Structure 1
Amino acid sequence: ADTIVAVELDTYPNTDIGDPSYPHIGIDIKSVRSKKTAKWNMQNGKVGTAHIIYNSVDKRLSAVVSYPNADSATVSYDVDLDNVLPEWVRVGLSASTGLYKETNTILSWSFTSKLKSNSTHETNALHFMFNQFSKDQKDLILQGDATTGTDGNLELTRVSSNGSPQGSSVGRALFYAPVHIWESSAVVASFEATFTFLIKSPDSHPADGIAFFISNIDSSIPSGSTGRLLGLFPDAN
């Protein structure tokens, strides 16, 4: 039902469904089986940063993930989003845990989209930036186990009182306002997203990951999408 385009930070290798045998970043177009992936040297307990960029002229979705003092990981995929997504969409973050677990903490999130028309100086834009989340964040649609306010952070999946991450959890956060990514008179459409995250697990095998995604405006968590499905897909096809 839902149309999903996402950049996944996959912490657990499910080789039975196409994941490489190591943590990786990937670009998912309507399927959890990434169209392209790159090895990611994930660091348990460290704050990392992900940057996602795209523009309608080049038609290439690219993402870069890094941690301080370390080399980055990058992945790119040629795709025309006009042919995949509706004209109006919502953007958000999703995460899940299953048998294995980890905290999926978001410390900041910014997004900027621009539509440049052929009229002189005619440019439409939307920009939001969160460097702190409140208990009652009215401009976010929280789904599943996601909550905001703990230490000013956004916890996508369940975490107990003692800070311990729970398994079989799924949660998403979408920006309240729909986003216009295509318009008939637009000559250039582009967006850039950045978010900082903290994945921590008491185990040697963290799971399952975090994903930045773009979807139809009325998207909701598919049934049974905990674990390897990242709260984004109904199955592994």
Structure 2
Amino acid sequence: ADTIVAVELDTYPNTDIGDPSYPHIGIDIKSVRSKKTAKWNMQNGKVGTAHIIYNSVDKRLSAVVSYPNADSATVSYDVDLDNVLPEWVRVGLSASTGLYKETNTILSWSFTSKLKSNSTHETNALHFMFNQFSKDQKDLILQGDATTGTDGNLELTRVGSSVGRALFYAPVHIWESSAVVASFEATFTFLIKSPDSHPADGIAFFISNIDSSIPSGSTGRLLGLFPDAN
């Protein structure tokens, strides 16, 4: 299967296994059973922002989700991604809807990754920023029900029970054995919108092997990321 490191915004009622019986943000390392979680107060129809950061000096992957005029939920996890991920990966977003009609709208998305080498300054860097998606977004690989262009946004899920992913087209070198400091950072703004006020829903920024594709039956609480709940 795909190796997948992800930061999920999960509102699924999956009081299923290690799953919080409440909406939470969690860090997932190769499994849908989050290695760490924190309670998140989803706000239906509000635009929230997620910031994920990681650097190899700390080896700590962190994420903060906030909504204007509210609190932020933050979650961290010590992990050395060099041991988990392959050197070259693809980064993307993903979402899955439950039995409900709700939309998983991405208003903006940016990412930056850098590899500073120890030989005085050999910095390599990749940075992309989308503040407006277009109908024919060729630097994105869309998977599932995901589409771009409607109002200049990226609709991950079809516009229930939908799954869609968007991955940036160029492979990203997230680490190399020679960097003295490798680090990345991503930010995206999203709008979860549902008529039922308790929608079971999921969005996640993720990092996977470059050929990753939606695994069979990874619907609902598996966020289009995992093939099973193991």
- Shorter chain as denominator, the TM-score bin is over 0.9
Kept after mapping to 2: 8 A contact 1:114/1:123: yes
Q: Does 1:11 align with 2:4?
A: no
Kept after mapping to 2: 8 A contact 1:51/1:63: yes
Aligned-residue identity in percent: 100
**Cα deviation, residue 18, structure 1:** 2.5
Describe the SS at the equivalent of 2:22: coil
- CA–CA separation in structure 2 for the residues paired with 1:144 and 1:61: 27
| Cα RMSD (Å) | 0.8
| Cα deviation digits, residues 138-168 of structure 1 (max 9, x gap) | 0000001000000000000011xxxxxxx11
Give the TM-score normalised by the residue count of structure 2: 0.98
- CA–CA separation in structure 2 for the residues paired with 1:17 and 1:148: 34
Describe the SS at the equivalent of 2:125: strand
Kept after mapping to 2: 8 A contact 1:26/1:37: yes
Which of 204, 208, 216 is the equivalent residue of 2:201?
208
Aligned to 1:225: 218
**Cα deviation, residue 13, structure 1:** 2.4
Kept after mapping to 2: 8 A contact 1:102/1:207: no
- CA–CA separation in structure 1 for the residues paired with 2:13 and 2:75: 17
Structure 2: segments with no counterpart, 5+ residues: none
**Cα deviation, residue 119, structure 1:** 1.7
**Cα deviation, residue 204, structure 1:** 2.2
**Cα deviation, residue 71, structure 1:** 1.5
**Cα deviation, residue 12, structure 1:** 1.9
- CA–CA separation in structure 2 for the residues paired with 1:36 and 1:82: 19
Kept after mapping to 1: 8 A contact 2:93/2:204: yes
- CA–CA separation in structure 2 for the residues paired with 1:180 and 1:129: 17
- CA–CA separation in structure 1 for the residues paired with 2:71 and 2:93: 24
**Cα deviation, residue 207, structure 1:** 2.0
**Cα deviation, residue 122, structure 1:** 1.2
- Runs of 4+ deviating beyond 3 Å: none
Residue range with higher mean Cα deviation, 48-57 or 93-102: 93-102
Kept after mapping to 1: 8 A contact 2:98/2:199: no
Question: Aligned pairs, how many?
Answer: 230
**Cα deviation, residue 101, structure 1:** 4.0
Kept after mapping to 2: 8 A contact 1:97/1:208: yes
Kept after mapping to 1: 8 A contact 2:93/2:203: yes
- CA–CA separation in structure 2 for the residues paired with 1:169 and 1:137: 21
| Cα deviation digits, residues 98-129 of structure 1 (max 9, x gap) | 22342100000000000000122210000000
Aligned to 1:198: 191
Describe the SS at the equivalent of 1:15: coil
Kept after mapping to 1: 8 A contact 2:95/2:223: yes
Residue range with higher mean Cα deviation, 195-204 or 116-125: 116-125
- CA–CA separation in structure 1 for the residues paired with 2:224 and 2:9: 13
Q: 1:101 to 1:34 in 2, by over 3 A?
A: farther
Describe the SS at the equivalent of 1:171: strand
Kept after mapping to 2: 8 A contact 1:5/1:29: yes
- CA–CA separation in structure 2 for the residues paired with 1:139 and 1:182: 22
**Cα deviation, residue 226, structure 1:** 1.1
Kept after mapping to 2: 8 A contact 1:101/1:207: no
- CA–CA separation in structure 2 for the residues paired with 1:70 and 1:208: 20
**Cα deviation, residue 184, structure 1:** 2.6
Give the TM-score normalised by the residue count of structure 1: 0.95
Kept after mapping to 2: 8 A contact 1:52/1:192: yes
| Cα deviation digits, residues 70-97 of structure 1 (max 9, x gap) | 1211000111100000000000000001
Describe the SS at the equivalent of 2:129: strand
